[PDB]
Paper text:
The conserved DEAD-box RNA helicase Vasa plays diverse functions in germ cell formation and germline maintenance in animals.
The crystal structure consists of one LOTUS dimer and two molecules of Vasa-CTD, each one bound to a LOTUS monomer on the side opposite to the dimerization interface. Hence, Vasa binding does not affect dimerization of the LOTUS domain, which is consistent with the experimentally determined 1:1 stoichiometry of the LOTUS–Vasa complex. The interface area of one LOTUS monomer–Vasa-CTD subcomplex measures 1080 Å2 (PISA analysis). In the complex, the LOTUS domain is contacted mainly via the α2 helix of the Vasa-CTD. Conversely, the Vasa-CTD is contacted by two helices of the LOTUS domain: the α2 helix, which is part of the trihelical bundle of the winged HTH (wHTH) core, and the α5 helix, which is positioned at the LOTUS domain C terminus. Interestingly, although one of our previously obtained crystal structures of the LOTUS domain alone also contained the C-terminal extension (α5 helix in the cocrystal), the extension did not adopt a particular secondary structure but most likely was disordered. This suggests that the LOTUS domain C-terminal extension forms an α helix upon interaction with Vasa. In Vasa, we identified two point mutations in the α2 helix of the CTD (F504E and F508E), each of which prevents the Vasa–eLOTUS interaction in GST pull-down assays. In the eLOTUS-bound CTD, the conformation of these motifs resembles that observed in DEAD-box helicases in their open state, suggesting that the conformation of the open state CTD does not change upon eLOTUS domain binding.
Author numbering:
A (entry chain C), C (entry chain A): 146 to 237
B (entry chain D), D (entry chain B): 465 to 580, 587 to 623
């Protein structure tokens, strides 16, 4: 991931911003990759071992849902807490 | 209102916005196209030490009002709002309006910049070609310089 | 993991039970391994790629804490919710 | 009270308990040594379709009372309590007492017998050697069969 973080210096913030926007229901790896390309114009820089990579990013969470899907989400930080709170309580 | 239009490709916008905010950020409203774009940008900017909130159509009324109060009271230096949710916003005397995504209707441009004064817009030549002629007319009507890229559309 | 689940038929419930008991603060992989050995008398049957395995267990969560530690925890299920609620609200 | 003592190694106890509950589970209190052991077992049993709650020293008073209420009202078929927490429990006419971990004091063994009737105990020969002679006396005094393994300690 050294190579990734070197080439994509804001990857932590980019991933967190995607997860934050999807925090009501969380988001799968496939959808993170899709959203990443849409928002940045570049393909997500990892193909495999993505769960492990995502879990090196401060405040990122993962869950094995009862549905079987692996869902990623976010814990509130001091700088984003106001936004996370709004997303979690906005229209269903 | 001092109006400046930059020609900016879609994926160069974020860096251009950060360059502008780094010079001066306080009292800036940034208009974007989508709800997800609004929250993404507000999160990203907040992590870059510009306390930024957002308003969009998925927000309950109380949440829109709170976001606006935070911007007004000074706790949030930047407000990101969608093109659509912008039309109903009651705020004026904005220091800086930034059209991160150009509106599709010139009436929206006129209304958005009527909220500030200083207005900066990012014109994406692969998306905004249709509004160029109307933009030229507004710039002329406002006695503002017209950049060549707008006339060549 | 097929080999692991074949040989350790209750491993999902064993892991969840450990996580549930530690739900107030969550627990790292090294601590899961040591708790597993203490409770069952057998070493935890995976050495590496443990995060991916744990995240195949329904209701298991993982978080990259701001401290930098990777911590695992649990979402409530119908059958254990009464217990998880007690653990989360017991003495600190 | 019908008293049965099984010689069970530490890591064979969980399976033995499940065998017993599978025959009949309703109204069972199970005593264990540790707080996390109690929660582990209650979680594990609940997942095996024996609705099981727990009481131990980390629980606030209201939580202990609620767990006891669930056991009394029938929503929890099994209650796991630590050996220490057991000495303050106000509950009798229990269908089955199980000493999953044998008490360290014979007075505790006797007290639990009084709370039910059937009592089944797991004797771990690598942990419970010291109580064997006292247990033999209690079994004999109560007209119960003494298993030979208790005499060889």
């Amino acid at each position: 991931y050294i190579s990734v973080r070197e080439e994509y210096p804001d990857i932590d913030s980019e991933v967190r911003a995607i997860l934050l926007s999807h925090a009501q229901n969380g988001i799968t790896i496939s959808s993170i990759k899709s959203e990443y390309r849409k928002l940045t114009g570049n393909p997500f820089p990892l193909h495999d071992n993505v769960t492990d990579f995502l879990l090196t990013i401060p405040n990122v969470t993962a869950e094995c849902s009862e549905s079987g899907k692996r869902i990623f989400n976010l814990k509130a930080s001091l700088k984003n807490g106001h936004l996370l709170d709004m997303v979690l309580n906005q229209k269903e | 209102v001092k109006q400046t239009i930059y020609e900016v490709n879609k994926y160069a916008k974020r860096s251009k916005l950060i360059e502008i905010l780094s010079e001066q950020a306080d009292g800036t409203i940034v208009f974007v196209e989508t709800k997800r774009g609004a929250d993404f940008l507000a999160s990203f900017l907040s992590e870059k030490e510009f306390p930024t909130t957002s308003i969009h159509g998925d927000r309950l009324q109380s949440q829109r009002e709170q976001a606006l109060r935070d911007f007004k009271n000074g706790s949030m230096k930047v407000l990101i709002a969608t093109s659509v949710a912008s039309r109903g916003l009651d705020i004026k005397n904005i220091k800086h309006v930034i059209n991160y995504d150009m509106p599709s209707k010139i009436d929206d441009y006129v209304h958005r910049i009527g909220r500030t004064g200083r207005a900066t817009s990012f014109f994406d030549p692969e998306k905004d070609r249709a509004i160029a002629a109307d933009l030229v007319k507004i710039l002329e009507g406002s006695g503002q310089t017209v950049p060549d890229f707008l006339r060549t559309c």
